[PDB]
Structures are given as C-alpha cells and as structure tokens.
Amino acid sequence: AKNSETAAKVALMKLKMHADGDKSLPQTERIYFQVFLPKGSKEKSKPMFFCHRWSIGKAIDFAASLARLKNTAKKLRLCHITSGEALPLDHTLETWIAKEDCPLYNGGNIILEYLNDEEQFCKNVESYLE
Numbered sequence: 001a002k003n004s005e006t007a008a009k010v011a012l013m014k015l016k017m018h019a020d021g022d023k024s025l026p027q028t029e030r031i032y033f034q035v036f037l038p039k040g041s042k043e044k045s046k047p048m049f050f051c052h053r054w055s056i057g058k059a060i061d062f063a064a065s066l067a068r069l070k071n072t073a074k075k076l077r078l079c080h081i082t083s084g085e086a087l088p089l090d091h092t093l094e095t096w097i098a099k100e101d102c103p104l105y106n107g108g109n110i111i112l113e114y115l116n117d118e119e120q121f122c123k124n125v126e127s128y129l130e
Contacts, residue, residue, distance in 0.1 A: 002129060003081050005105055012107030014047075020066055021049035029053070031093055033110045035063050036128045038076070043067075045109075050093060057089035063112050074114035077122070081109040084125030 001007065015032040032049040046067055050059045056078055064076050077086040083102045096104035104110065109129070113122045 008105030008107035015107055019047035019049045025051050031106045036111045038113045052093045056087045056091055077115045079111040079122045084121040
C-alpha cells in the first residue's frame with residue numbers, strides 16, 4: 001500500500017517541491033525518490049531525484065553525497081523498499097521501471113544502507129518504514 005504505484009504518484013508532487021538533484025536534467029529525464037538513509041541516521045530520509053539512465057552505482061554515489069555520507073568495513077547500496085535486494089551496481093535505474101515484480105516508481109521509496117561488499121540484500125527491510 002505505502003509502496004504501491006498509486007502511493008508513488010500521490011507522493012510525486014511533494015517530492016518535486018522538496019527533492020534535490022542535478023537540475024540541468026530535463027524534467028522528463030528525472031526519477032524522484034524518498035531515499036531512506038542508513039539505520040542510525042538522524043534524518044530518516046531525504047527527497048532526491050536522479051537521471052533515469054544513471055547506473056545504480058552512480059545513483060548511490062550521488063545519494064551518498066547529498067546525504068553527506070562521503071565524510072569503513074561496509075559500502076553504501078541502494079536497496080529495494082519491499083524486497084530488500086541490493087540493486088546491482090551496473091544496472092540503470094530505467095531497468096526497474098514498470099516491471100511486475102518489485103518495480104521502482106517515480107515518486108516511490110528506496111533504501112540507502114551500509115552492506116558488506118558482495119552482500120545481496122539488507123535485512124529487516126520492513127523496519128525502515130516502521
């Protein structure tokens with residue numbers, strides 16, 4: 001419900017008001033997320049937008065920057081909000097649009113979390129929204 005297509009579209013207008021990102025991107029090239037930050041972050045989440053053709057690794061790098069997490073044993077990974085899957089670094093965000101299983105939505109939620117190198121999913125994915 002909170003992670004559905006409709007919930008993402010309903011959140012999208014506020015995300016457009018509040019998100020940071022590279023504003024030289026044409027509007028149609030942008031995908032907006034509420035980005036939930038690693039456990040222990042005082043700020044639970046931050047609104048961000050990305051180029052939809054960026055790789056996950058690029059998006060992670062951009063999000064870590066905005067969240068001031070570039071200032072260890074673990075690497076930051078974007079993780080699907082329902083499956084917990086650490087999205088593969090080389091895939092483009094575009095790859096997740098529309099898909100039947102665990103899509104990404106323009107306006108949706110996503111997780112940024114410290115994982116071990118090679119770790120595949122973040123544990124307790126439901127808890128980021130609890």
